[PDB]
Design a protein around this ligand. Sequence first.
Ligand SMILES: CCCCCCCCCCCCCCOc1cccc(O)c1C(=O)O
Lengths: 206, 200
Amino acid sequence: PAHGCRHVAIIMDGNGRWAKKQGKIRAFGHKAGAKSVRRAVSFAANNGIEALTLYAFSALDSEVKSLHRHNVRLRIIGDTSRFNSRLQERIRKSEALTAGNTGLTLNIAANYGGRWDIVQGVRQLAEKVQQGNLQPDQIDEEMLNQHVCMHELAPVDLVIRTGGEHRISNFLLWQIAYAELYFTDVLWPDFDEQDFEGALNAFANR
Amino acid sequence: GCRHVAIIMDGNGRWAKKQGKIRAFGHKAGAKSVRRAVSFAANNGIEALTLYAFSWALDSEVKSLHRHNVRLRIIGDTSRFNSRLQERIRKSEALTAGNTGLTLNIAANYGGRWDIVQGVRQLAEKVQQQPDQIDEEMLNQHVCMHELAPVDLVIRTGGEHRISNFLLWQIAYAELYFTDVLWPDFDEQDFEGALNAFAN
Ligand SMILES: CCCCCCCCCCCCCCOc1cccc(O)c1C(=O)O
């Protein structure tokens, strides 16, 4: 924690382009990006990062065993409701397995949108209104902040986007109010331990 | 086609410091840079320019803006502002409300989070009298600037790479452009550079 960064969020763009530059099809890029994911997760866990939130931008897993091993707590954020029910149980089971883990919290955005995220936290507040439990004039920023995804973690300190586009693309919105935004042209499958080091270094400075 | 630009105008104080001057002199060179940006936007067919002053002028500039066919709006929490200022804002907005050129939104005591929370306070008062009908489009209709073109481009001068609680909901799909140029120095050429970035 020289870098002092508790919660990094990453928009992992560039898989497709990475594959095309090599004359390979899209699928090769995705497999390469998966390897980049494991590399990043390791890095975060070995550098005292408290939370890493990953957004795969334009799937599945046997990593859970390995994550659970490294005391990583796994959370899926997004609208899982529509997922075919086998999928939902698998997610639930992976979350329940690692729920008591105390190392890195790894949030993996799936069918996630920043606006959806805010909207659903609004529903909850609007729920506790109808129950007559809370007044409409009582709603403040801290309030609505306790009902959006990852309210329980440290605030997002750093958002990295690879692949060259300079936009949020409906990823976290409420939660990035004060975050450092770091954009790199590096494509996601080449984004390595030094690039991640590069990013944290730049967060340090203000 | 860039329709709505939003600017986080940072670096006035640092500019003053850099010039061997006190803070107030940075604030006057900042005001000039506002006038330059406003003319530029109007001159290049931008529909909406939203300006966030980041680390009172109505009677000085309102007549010129009206002349120039600019519609003025203030966004932010002005509830705790003097009653006279509130009347002037109202008057100024009313005076320019039919102008057909640039819409200039000035963000005064504004916060992105505050803007959503105050949109949330609205729906929650109507819930007190359907919490499966509050969806994205419904909340969008209660956030600032919903009736205008969506923000295409957010410019932040002064070398910081953050949004600093400016538009949040509104910038979901905007291009974000960060420049080390300090606001008082941000000119037409710099504005073009940013429009170029948006074009690619
Ligand atoms: C085509 C028409 C040309 C005429 C254009 C007229 C626009 C005139 C506005 C100039 C003054 C800037 C006040 C708004 O921003 C601020 C708000 C609060 C505190 C500040 O320090 C500032 C700041 O200095 O950046």
